[PDB]
């Protein structure tokens, strides 16, 4: 499964995701930070406890920057693996993305 | 040596897969890179198969554990780009969908 | 719903046989108790089956409140029995289904 | 540290906690099951560690669901864990 | 035999301590079981001494973990899981536990 | 797999095992124990990194107790996680093998 | 902040620092990759430790807002440290190693 | 807390080592390995369940690797981690000993 702890202070709002990302539980992250987008305060999303993340999990990351950013926000992503910086490099994201 | 798997064309048991083809890819003695770059292909093409599936299912999926190379086969735009890049075979042909990646030791 | 596995008749892939088993019981809600208790019943079955012949093959019904394994082709046959909810035997190869209901 | 993981479906709540409940987390999780308690599931299958700090704060939130007439229960509880609640005579009044 | 540690009277160091038990204790022989069993009791011991610098002193004896920790809800907990403690009154909590 | 750790001192072995005992890995337990069993020794076996055992486990160290009491030594089975016990007393073979 | 440590000058206990050292490093927020070199580096600051002893090693981890400085007082190691770490240093009358390793 | 695992069929020897190689292990390692190293037999010793190494379990290797070399034998080092590698490549080693994945 996946455990996602939302924290929000000041709207300075902190996402821990544990666990894995997959096309099961990418659905389930989106529903739990879409209304995180919405308001479009600074949230920074932490991956340190990531065991496994796919092109969903990038789905999901994709659809909150642009979600975050039509509403006037910002996205951080930190702190990522090595081998989750290079699974976001490869696809031509880390560019676009905070990390 | 062959090992055969069916699973319901399912989101929650693309997981197991992951986890069998660990065990299949431990064993044989893969990198521990290249066991997790195997659980993205493998995953990724059963993503597929359900996303597919989706509109109308069962998915089939089959190890082949040779000596030098690792052969997986799953059967009913970013993934497949991962899968390709990230095995070092991939054949895929309709039809649905069975794709064939193989990944050398 | 089911899942199916076949493998080499071999003691190789009993642990294999191990690994999907515990993904499948996770999903579902067994315990870490029930979930290695459910491993060494299952691996019995399968252990008779690679000592029989080969391939071994190996259905997991998993259903609402139980989940029904199905192995097929006297310390041990305690260990499943005494593991499982409910054991039964049949011949001629052999054919082990074992279902344990979660509770 | 820590992980809390809610999801609000059918005026019921699921809470699945993974990590440690020791002095240093059990304000954290009071301070997010408490706007939960002021019907709630709670899932300890991958809690790592408790100590009586973690009891205090349910005993606080069960407190608090008797209080308001909501329910609680907890549940895929380890063995062990299950034990250390027996030893403490709370798995006759909580689950 | 004698094992020191000092870490800020702060909540979060307890883990630390938890996690040096561990060690001393996983050197013993003492079952899995037993220092899980351990890390509740030291984690007590050091919650309660936090509610500034704790000590904490680990003596490793032959067959007996003796841990000490200077600087209510619990106390139940502690004398349950170990084999003998005492206390001193500043507050000092004494703590051992014997092999199975 | 497994993995069998052999430490002969005082005219005594103790091997500690460490992974599966099962239908693969018991073969290689049965040769490596039985040539230290046939020759009287006195075993000390350590399951305390065991993380899985069937009946195959069971049986090669049945077989090893036997070989043991027919060639004069003593075996003894130590730090065994709460699983162990209760698989040995479920088999009704804590009766016999030695456990600690 | 600051943690204090004091350990027989033995090999046995070289692993329970590893244990703390690791648990800190994790909790400051550090590479796996630059855990395990913490790992590597202090052991070997022990290593020679408790060879140059026999004995006690006192050990003092000094977890800084941005940086972890590592005191240990009581050759390819030496090597290992030096290579591992951003800075280290050395004194002696009894020796005191200090190396720091960057938080980033 | 090391286990080392001897499996020795005619002259070929496999070492499988699981578990931290330091200054308290180190010593285990090399009573365990001298005496088949001094058999002038083909070593292969299999690294893959090793949590830990530094400078003395490198000691304990070469030390091995010189011994072996000393009474006409070989040494092959095998199923070695990514960081391990590395290990063995910043102190040159993997210069000296044949060294694999």
């Known amino acids: 499964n996946i ?16 666990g894995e990302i997959d ?19 600074d949230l920074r999303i932490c991956l340190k406890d990531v065991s496994y993340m796919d092109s969903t999990g990038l789905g999901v990351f994709v659809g909150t920057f642009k979600m975050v950013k039509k509403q006037g926000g910002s996205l951080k992503l930190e702190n990522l693996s090595e081998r989750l910086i290079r699974l976001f490099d490869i696809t031509g994201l880390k560019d676009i993305i905070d990390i | 040596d062959y090992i055969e798997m069916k699973v ?10 992951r986890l069998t083809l660990s065990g299949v890819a431990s064993r044989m003695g893969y990198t521990y890179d290249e066991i997790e770059d ?11 198969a359900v996303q597919h599936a989706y509109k109308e299912g069962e998915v089939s999926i089959r190890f082949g554990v040779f000596e030098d190379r690792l052969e997986v086969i799953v059967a009913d735009g970013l993934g497949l780009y991962l899968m390709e890049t990230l095995m070092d075979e991939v ?4 039809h649905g969908v069975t794709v064939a ?5």
């Open chain 1, 3 to 18: 455990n996602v702890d939302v924290k929000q202070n000041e709207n300075d709002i902190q996402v821990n995701i544990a």
């Open chain 1, 23 to 41: 096309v099961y539980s990418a659905p389930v992250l989106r529903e739990k930070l879409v209304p995180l987008a919405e308001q479009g305060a």
């Open chain 2, 8 to 17: 319901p064309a399912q989101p929650e048991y693309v997981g197991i897969i």
């Open chain 2, 38 to 48: 195997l659980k993205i292909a493998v995953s990724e093409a059963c993503t597929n």
């Open chain 2, 91 to 94: 054949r895929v042909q309709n």
């Open chain 2, 101 to 105: 990646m193989t990944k050398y030791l």
